[PDB]
Symmetry: D2
Subunit: 229 residues, 4 copies
Amino acid sequence: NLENKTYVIMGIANKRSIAFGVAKVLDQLGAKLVFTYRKERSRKELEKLLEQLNQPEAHLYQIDVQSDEEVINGFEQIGKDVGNIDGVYHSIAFANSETSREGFLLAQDISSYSLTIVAHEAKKLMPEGGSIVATTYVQNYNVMGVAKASLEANVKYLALDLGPDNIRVNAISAGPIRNTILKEIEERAPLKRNVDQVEVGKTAAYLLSDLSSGVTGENIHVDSGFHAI
Amino acid sequence: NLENKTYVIMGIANKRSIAFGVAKVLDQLGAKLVFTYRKERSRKELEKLLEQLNQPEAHLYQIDVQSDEEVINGFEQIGKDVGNIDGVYHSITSREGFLLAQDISSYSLTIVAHEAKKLMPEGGSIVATTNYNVMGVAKASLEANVKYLALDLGPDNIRVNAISADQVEVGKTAAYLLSDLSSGVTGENIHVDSG
Amino acid sequence: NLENKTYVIMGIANKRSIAFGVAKVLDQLGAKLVFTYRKERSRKELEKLLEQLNQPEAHLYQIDVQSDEEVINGFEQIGKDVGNIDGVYHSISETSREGFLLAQDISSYSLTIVAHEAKKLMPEGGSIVATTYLYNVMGVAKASLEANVKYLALDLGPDNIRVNAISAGPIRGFNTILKEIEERAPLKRNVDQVEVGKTAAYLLSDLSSGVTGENIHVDSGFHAI
Amino acid sequence: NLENKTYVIMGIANKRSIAFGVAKVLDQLGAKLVFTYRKERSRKELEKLLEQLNQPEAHLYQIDVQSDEEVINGFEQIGKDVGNIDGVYHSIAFTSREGFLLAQDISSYSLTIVAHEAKKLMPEGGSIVATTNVMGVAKASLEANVKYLALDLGPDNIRVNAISAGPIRNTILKEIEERAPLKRNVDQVEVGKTAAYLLSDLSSGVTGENIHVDSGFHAI
């Protein structure tokens, strides 16, 4: 399916990382993978996980999307080091000033803008097109909600903007995974159970692959159809 | 990918039918396919087209979703003839107009779903592909149907999703939806329309 | 506000009909009101209700939206008896084919036809409002309605006719849900007939002059959850 | 209707401002109005326009929603100067990381903070109204914000709703008087009207809603 495809996978932290699920699946289909971590602390942990995979060699890159420079440099090195890529999976989600302006903006920066920039930089490794995918993860006033809204919109507009560049941008809206919210989901999710990294990875594969070749700007809920309730 | 999977494919009329695109893709993925046509006039066309495919043998069934009896019998024969299936692809001013539109476009799903359910003891995937446009009103009804059927059949481990509309690209998404790949997605509507 | 405006108000059945809340409000603003009932049994109840209002005289009209004929004649009599009007308020896995279609017929199509017929009493345009209350086929019917509203709003734009919907929250299983919507819905309280009538008035009135194809939730913003 | 109602009206810049249309309508209904401007340069223009209205007295307040400090202080002065208010109309208008964030800041967050501050002048509840490439993303954020605020403030009996308006002042305009159902084009007053509806008790069950005042163009 994906032999000879090269994908950048952002946001692995531990073996529980959704991003990592996504990783195991693409590995299994025979794509070559590149990874980005944020904290130096996590570099070792990634090298460990790349063992679990049949990855010919280890291509790790420290990128903090929160900063233009790192993202710019990171993609260039990947470019230099690996050549063109077929797609990017961008997993993020970080809620830490309950109503603070900094809170708000920071949320936006991480949750919505990171995509914009990644996209702008990844685009340079995708001269013939490719697929970008953003995966997505309560109190008084939910700022994280407002960030996701921003995200989803951003996906539409990037999808729209990069259309001509034959680059597809879609999102995965994830439902919960390995306890009161596990009450709620197993309770009310139509499919009557909880999703998990793999299921996501599967749709992720779908999206990054040519299989979804007519689909851009879409947001797919991998949540045992909890959305429809 | 799909070897040993059995799908019912409804709405082929000619080689241009979206449903047909969907077919080619599933055939190529090694799934065994069952077909339904409406007019007798088109049983022949379908036999023609099954020639383009690598289908061991031809399973054709005349079914007018517009009528309970045909649908009921239709699926039973499929049942008897083929045994269980893994999912179904369902491709298709005045009070009469409105209601007819609703009947064919939205309800057809409901009843198909109810009948196909009987061939999917262990779950499966159903997929529906899609001046005052009563037609719009019919699609709205449809999409809703999908959500509530998705909802109703969740517990029966049956996933209901829609594709909003070339043929091949649909087929491929179609393939995604019908396959295990889409294992957490139910009640979703996917736009294959170059966004 | 509404003196010399004339509105047709459909779907009152008892003093508790939301359609009646709507009525009280438009009465209070000085509009002349026409009424439609389905069951003969309820014509008396309506007369009794019109007593609560300062309605000069009683224009009642028996109409079953479920039938083209009644709807046609119905509007023509209103036409003849009242002349033109300014708007209309229209309040109304297993599942059989009949059920489905019936639901569609009543919940969606009814509007279409009413629209088509009221149109004839609004040569200079006006406002049509559909209210909605709340495996459920009923959902599917609402879906179909809401779309219809958009498409009618669309098709009637040029005839200067605005079509909008109100989507309403509970009043009168029930006792349990009048609790539900009181905890999680923002505002905390439950809605009521009046609230609707108010928004209804907005919509029917010139107040809502750029608004068509819109659906307004009068549910203490429950929709937002 | 609106006698003895007090509303804060933000975003007037010239006689063409939508906010100003809103203003005319509220004035005409007998509400007392307070205004905020951003640029010192625009205070005089506001005094000019307040002449067209029957405003007992001019309460003007310089507020840059871009800065917590001004917004906090402004509302207090309003508080001190006029006492409690019945609602607020928040009208605000018009690549890189900064661009992105700026847009959010002004388009979406401004509401959040204004809300949070306005809240203190509405002990018994009231109505807040926000009128409306990256700019798209900003509106999305806004529309979401309105929902969540509507949601957060429900218990305080404060209603938050938005108005989405179709353009006012010859190309992209043609497309509209062409395509849109209601057949002509939209204007200040129209907005003012719905605005009135939303700020008034008339919209008493409605919160978290977005109304399109665009001759039903949204429906297309």
